[PDB]
């Protein structure tokens, strides 16, 4: 289908890892969106290629297609104009209750219709969430995304090498709850090796403002044990959610 001779590429929206992430307008159509560049994880993308193009939700972030040259190759990608939470986080150090409700929520039901197409995506965090123009939260990034059943986002089964569920996102899910809350994931270490450890005992502590609401929530979302684990029904039906959300 597309080439790079049918886009009009404007200022760079951010860096990435095999490379960075351009605005660009499709010339025919005049179509605003963004486009990934980049130069073994080949099969890896083949999947997140499959998957998210395949995947159509409000709160994901839409695949067009690809296409690539001699040199890179480039994925076609919607274009998420309030750039991502990571940097609104950043900017802000921390969300309030009302704000992080919304995002978990916006969140919760990407999630659950991600699961039920039996999708996983095991990479949740600020850096891989953008904001559309109505500043709603799109996951982005299925490069870690597979659809069978930094380690700061990562739960105790998958660190320690253990076949992991659906259950992992909502692990992520309170992980990033958390962080927007306090500006810091819960497991926050200064070296891989001790953030491990405190994932594997889920070490983690409340800053004094952080409401009793709120941390029945996340306290219930961080268990070791998967089986343990809320669902995303009831995320969606937790009070200080539903008093907060939106
Ligand atoms: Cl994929 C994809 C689709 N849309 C985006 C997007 N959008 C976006 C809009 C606006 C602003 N502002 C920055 C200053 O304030 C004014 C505008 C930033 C990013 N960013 C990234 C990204 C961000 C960071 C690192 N690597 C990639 C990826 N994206």
Redesign the pocket.
């Known amino acids: 289908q597309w080439a790079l001779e049918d886009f009009e590429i404007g200022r760079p ?4 890892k095999f490379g ?2 351009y ?1 660009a307008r499709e010339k025919q159509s005049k179509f605003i ?2 486009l ?1 560049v980049l130069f073994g994880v080949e099969h890896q993308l083949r999947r997140e290629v499959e998957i998210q193009s395949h995947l159509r939700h409000p709160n994901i ?1 839409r695949l067009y297609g690809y296409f690539h040259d001699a040199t890179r190759v480039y ?1 076609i ?8 939470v ?2 609104e986080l950043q900017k802000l150090s921390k969300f309030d209750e009302q704000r992080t409700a919304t995002y978990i929520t916006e969140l919760a039901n990407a999630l659950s219709y991600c699961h039920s197409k039996r999708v996983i995506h095991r990479d949740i965090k600020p ?1 891989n969430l ?1 904001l559309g123009s109505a500043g709603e939260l799109k996951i ?2 299925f490069g870690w995304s597979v659809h069978a059943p930094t380690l700061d986002y990562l739960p105790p089964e998958m660190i320690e090498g253990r076949m992991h569920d659906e259950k992992v996102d909502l692990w992520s899910l309170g992980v990033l709850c958390y962080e927007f809350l306090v500006g810091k994931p819960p497991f926050e270490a200064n070296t891989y090796q001790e953030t491990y450890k405190r994932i594997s005992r889920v070490e983690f502590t409340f800053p004094d403002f952080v409401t009793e609401g709120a941390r029945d929530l996340i306290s219930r979302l961080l268990k070791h044990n998967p089986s343990q684990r809320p669902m995303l029904r009831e995320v969606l039906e937790h009070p200080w959610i539903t008093a907060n959300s939106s």
């Open positions: 929206l951010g860096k990435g960075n992430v605005l969106l963004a990934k972030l994925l990608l919607e274009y998420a104009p309030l750039g991502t990571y940097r850096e953008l982005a990034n």
